[PDB]
Paper text:
Of particular interest are type I (oxygen independent) bacterial nitroreductases, which are flavoenzymes that catalyse the concerted transfer of two electrons from reduced nicotinamide adenine dinucleotide (phosphate) (NAD(P)H) to the nitro group of the substrate. This results in the formation of a reduced nitroso intermediate, which subsequently undergoes further reduction to generate the final hydroxylamine or amine product(s).
NTR 2.0 was derived from the NfsB orthologue of Vibrio vulnificus by introduction of rationally identified F70A and F108Y residue substitutions. To better understand the improved enzymatic mechanism of NTR 2.0, we have now crystallised and solved the structure of NTR 2.0 to 1.85 Angstrom resolution. In both our wild-type and mutant structures, one FMN and one acetate molecule occupy each active site. NTR 2.0 and the parental enzyme share high structural similarity (root-mean-square deviation (RMSD) of 0.32 Å); however, significant differences were noted in the active site. In the NTR 2.0 structure, mutation of active site residue 108 from phenylalanine to tyrosine introduces hydrogen bonding from the Y108 hydroxyl group to nearby residue E102. This new bond may stabilise the active site, lowering the energy of the transition state during metronidazole catalysis. Notably, the NTR 2.0 structure also exhibits a widened substrate entrance channel compared to the wild-type, resulting from the displacement of residues F123, F124 and F68 and the removal of the aromatic side chain at residue F70. Widening of this channel likely reduces steric hindrance, potentially allowing faster and more efficient passage of NAD(P)H cofactor, reactants and end-products into and out of the active site.
Numbering used by the authors:
A (entry chain A), B (entry chain A): 1 to 217
Write the structure that this text describes.
Amino acid sequence: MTIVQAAQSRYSTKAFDASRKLPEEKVAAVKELIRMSASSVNSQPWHFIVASSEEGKARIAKATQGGFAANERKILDASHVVVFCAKTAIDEAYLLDLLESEDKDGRYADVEAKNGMHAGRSFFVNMHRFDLKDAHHWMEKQVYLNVGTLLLGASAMEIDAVPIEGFDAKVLDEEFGLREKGFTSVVIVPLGYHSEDDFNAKLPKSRWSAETVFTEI
Amino acid sequence: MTIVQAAQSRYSTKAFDASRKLPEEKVAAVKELIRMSASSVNSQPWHFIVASSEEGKARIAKATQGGFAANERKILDASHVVVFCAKTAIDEAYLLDLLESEDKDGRYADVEAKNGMHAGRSFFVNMHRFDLKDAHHWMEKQVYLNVGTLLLGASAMEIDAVPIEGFDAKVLDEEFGLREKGFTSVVIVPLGYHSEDDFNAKLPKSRWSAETVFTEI
Ligand SMILES: Cc1cc2nc3c(=O)[nH]c(=O)nc-3n(C[C@H](O)[C@H](O)[C@H](O)COP(=O)(O)O)c2cc1C
Ligand SMILES: Cc1cc2nc3c(=O)[nH]c(=O)nc-3n(C[C@H](O)[C@H](O)[C@H](O)COP(=O)(O)O)c2cc1C
């Protein structure tokens, strides 16, 4: 299957088959894929909650009650659920921890290259913190880029998924103590195999035409 | 090559081989991949500029001058460059045009299902416009999700890429009249084949460990 066929055949699963679980190899591949995502200045401004148990899924589904109840069964019936969380703030200590992990990983030949990268990344993060004043939105954008990798990657691995914004992030954040750890939930992605009765598995994919969305130069 | 190997082997290209051009089949596959991206409520709040000519690339590179000059040669030497643009605002007319494209595409059995989807999508877009007051950030997040699909997809198609935030979006917007058309440039992605002298092609990829970024439940 080509990556284009993966993009054409994936869809938002509206009903999972609660009997069908992902093999351990597919779960380990999902986790490696999202840890490896690109991010502006290698900020990696993310944390991931992975639920593989009925108790874990029930805890996440506390955030899909009332007006969000249409998403509850997607969480409960999926095999595995990934909660994508973004950093709520960014500071020099996080940037120094990041620079040290890259130094340990062999990215800097000398202290000159290391100091240079810090000064560059610092200039840039501070532009988002203090000049655009949008650092939380900028970090959540990197987390959405990560989600995109998972939606395409899941399809290429023949895994059904649905991205979910329709949840109460205060309830989910409190469920896992995320705000006191500097994180906030932004997207829920349940993973598994769609049920035969998934209405959306039998609808055509709808997108703007290429002549609408492309300007060629 | 598995999708995990695609995530492990891709990297941010810092120097392209200006002699090496993408085959027409690879360019058409990139364009189909990004048109097919998922987005919240199928908002597809995007437009794409694709430059395949020296003149096109020179026009985009006007936005990588002065403090952004470190990105100029990535644009000039790449085979093809994709500018990802987000909508600057969203209203009922865009939502009615979207609902009509989905109706034409066969997503609604009856006017009941159509009216239901409009009322649901409208409630939700209006929550971003008027309650969170973050509609432009919410739309740009969908465009970043799209970029993620391209970074992973390019790697699976054996195409080098680099995502670029380091550009002057006012200069790029004015270059293509985007703001008067309701769009703004958010990410530049040059595509092609890295040059042998790309320093970053010989550095290890650096990410947080799985024990840092995962909570298992
Ligand atoms: C949104 C975004 C914007 C980026 N902007 C730039 C840029 O302006 N110039 C640059 O050289 N690299 C840029 N990068 C590349 C990142 O530094 C890179 O993705 C990160 O260090 C992870 O390394 P990798 O892409 O080699 O795996 C950007 C990446 C992302 C995700
Ligand atoms: C950020 C994001 C959030 C989403 N939130 C929900 C949700 O809460 N519930 C839902 O059923 N679908 C949700 N979707 C699925 C979209 O409606 C779907 O991606 C879009 O209609 C395109 O269709 P496709 O994913 O079938 O190709 C979401 C998608 C994205 C990208």
